[PDB]
């Protein structure tokens, strides 16, 4: 039934943004309401998305899914019957080149800055002692353009890190950290590392048990004429799949 509600959307730094919407408002409607509330230009809306996440005790975010066009975010979150789930606004492109468009606007730039800062703070981005010194300086100095330009050069800038999970490559039940970005999946074995190029994935599938446990399996071209299925077991399997699809999509738009 259509009725007006207040919705909390969090930014990357935990600042809360409250918007008035209808229960029957869809994802795009809510997104537009948030953007309106923040004074974000219309022409940047396509650069950001809303995500459903679970907040853990330590305040870190486990990404659950990107909200799709047909969804009703209020329903989406309330129907889960858990206060741990939050809607988050975050940049939704992969090529850091698009940062150029976003940084032309002050509010866009603030959003990108906030999420980059949080990415470093949560250890998603890997830096050296000197870089850490500089970064920590700009933070105080708040130039932000320069801060972002520096951040763009950092390892795994623009990547999404997932909660520790397991995979069956190279061995069964191996503990792994998965990260998605720059058209690949990075697997850190927490140390040896693997890179699974999206263009080398013939397909992927999200599976669930029955007599919970979610898996993402992709059929990977390991070498010439040799395909091998790789399976990652993770509660964020769907988010990983969404990311694979999203990266492929971005590649299609770019290719065209």
């Amino acid at each position: 039934p259509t009725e007006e509600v207040s919705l909390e959307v969090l930014l990357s730094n935990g600042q809360k943004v409250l918007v008035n919407v209808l229960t029957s408002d869809q994802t795009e409607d809510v997104l537009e309401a948030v953007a309106a509330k923040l004074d974000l230009p219309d022409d940047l809306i396509g650069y950001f998305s809303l995500f459903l996440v679970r907040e853990k005790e330590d305040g870190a975010f486990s990404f659950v899914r990107k909200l799709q066009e047909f969804e009703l975010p209020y329903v989406s979150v309330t129907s889960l019957r858990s206060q741990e789930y939050k809607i988050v606004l975050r940049k939704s492109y992969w090529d850091s080149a698009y940062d150029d468009d976003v940084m032309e606007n002050r509010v866009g730039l603030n959003l990108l800055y906030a999420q980059t800062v949080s990415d470093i703070e949560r250890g998603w981005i890997l830096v050296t002692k000197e870089q850490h010194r500089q970064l920590k300086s700009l933070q105080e100095k708040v130039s932000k353009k320069e801060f972002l330009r520096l951040a763009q050069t950092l390892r795994h800038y623009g990547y999404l890190r997932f909660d520790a999970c397991v995979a069956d490559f190279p061995e069964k039940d191996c503990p792994v950290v998965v990260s998605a970005g720059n058209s690949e999946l990075s697997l850190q074995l927490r140390l040896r590392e693997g890179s699974f190029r999206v263009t080398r994935m013939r397909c992927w599938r999200v599976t669930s048990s029955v007599p919970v446990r979610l898996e993402l399996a992709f059929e990977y071209l390991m070498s010439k004429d040799r395909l091998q299925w790789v399976t990652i077991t993770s509660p964020q399997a769907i988010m990983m799949s969404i990311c694979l699809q999203s990266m492929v999509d971005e590649l299609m738009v770019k290719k065209s």
Partner: peptide
């Protein structure tokens, strides 16, 4: 079942 990746092989 498994959705084919349109970019696969290139």
């Amino acid at each position: 079942t498994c959705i084919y990746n349109p970019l696969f092989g290139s």
